[PDB]
């Protein structure tokens, strides 16, 4: 195991996946525990407004985030050269605090591996306590046999588009291209557009130590 206090530290699992503390929202500490397979929110002090910013996004990832990518990952790639991107997933719980467990796909009109990518998709399996995604609600979509409720908006920075399941999801495998799809056909994408990183973690506001990725999984196939 290993452990990450700095707010921007990393490290990587498996020879496959980077490990992110990426405390970016918060004055207080946090702790990840990196293992094989996933981490642990060891830490996590402190709260966040719950309308604003969350502390952090603690979370597991393939592709390229602000410099920094994952070993040998195929992205950035061009959408129409994907035959699928299979991705799964454990989360472990917590009851209270306050907190999202997301999913964060990144796409963009380059082969972007810095900055800010034009367009967020959040796929939120779970969500504890009064949060609620960016935007406004737009109504239900149907993707990958699950419902969610589709919210869209901006940050400022980017467009975000938000898919949220009915109740907590625990473990899931699902192909991140339907996600993808459904928002190509909103026209925040388009099909020659680049995905640039898969990333899975939380979003906590009010404490968040024993969340955790028990095991993440997430390849892109052309
Ligand atoms: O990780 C190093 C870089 O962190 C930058 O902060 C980013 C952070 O990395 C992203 O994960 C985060 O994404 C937000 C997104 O903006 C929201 F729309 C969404 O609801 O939630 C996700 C996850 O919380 O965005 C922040 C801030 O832009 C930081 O700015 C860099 O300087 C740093 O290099």
């Given at each position: 195991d290993t452990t990450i206090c700095e707010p921007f530290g990393t490290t990587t699992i498996q020879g496959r996946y980077v490990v992110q503390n990426?405390?970016?929202?918060?004055?207080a500490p946090q702790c990840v525990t990196a293992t094989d397979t996933g981490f642990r929110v060891t830490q996590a002090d402190g709260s966040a407004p719950t309308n604003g910013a969350p502390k952090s996004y603690p979370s597991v990832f393939n592709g390229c985030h602000y410099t920094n990518?994952?070993?040998?990952?195929?992205?950035?790639?061009?959408?129409?050269?994907?035959?699928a991107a299979p991705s799964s997933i454990s989360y472990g719980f917590v009851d209270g605090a306050v907190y999202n467990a997301s999913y964060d796909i990144w796409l963009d009109?380059?082969?972007?591996?810095?900055?800010?990518?034009q367009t967020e998709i959040m796929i939120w399996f779970n969500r504890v306590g009064p949060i609620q995604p960016i935007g406004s609600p737009v109504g239900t979509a149907s993707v990958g046999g699950r419902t969610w409720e589709v919210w869209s908006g901006g940050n400022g920075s980017n467009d975000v588009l938000s898919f949220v399941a009915p109740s907590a999801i625990s473990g899931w495998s699902f192909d991140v291209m339907d996600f993808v799809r459904a928002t190509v056909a909103r026209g925040?994408?388009?099909?020659?557009?680049?995905?640039?990183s898969v990333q899975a973690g939380f979003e906590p506001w009010q404490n968040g130590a024993?969340?955790?990725?028990n095991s993440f999984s997430s390849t892109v196939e052309t």
């Open positions: 990426n405390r970016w929202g918060s004055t990518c994952s070993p040998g990952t195929d992205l950035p790639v061009r959408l129409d050269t994907v035959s009109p380059t082969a972007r591996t810095d900055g800010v990518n925040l994408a388009e099909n020659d557009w680049y995905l640039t024993g969340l955790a990725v």
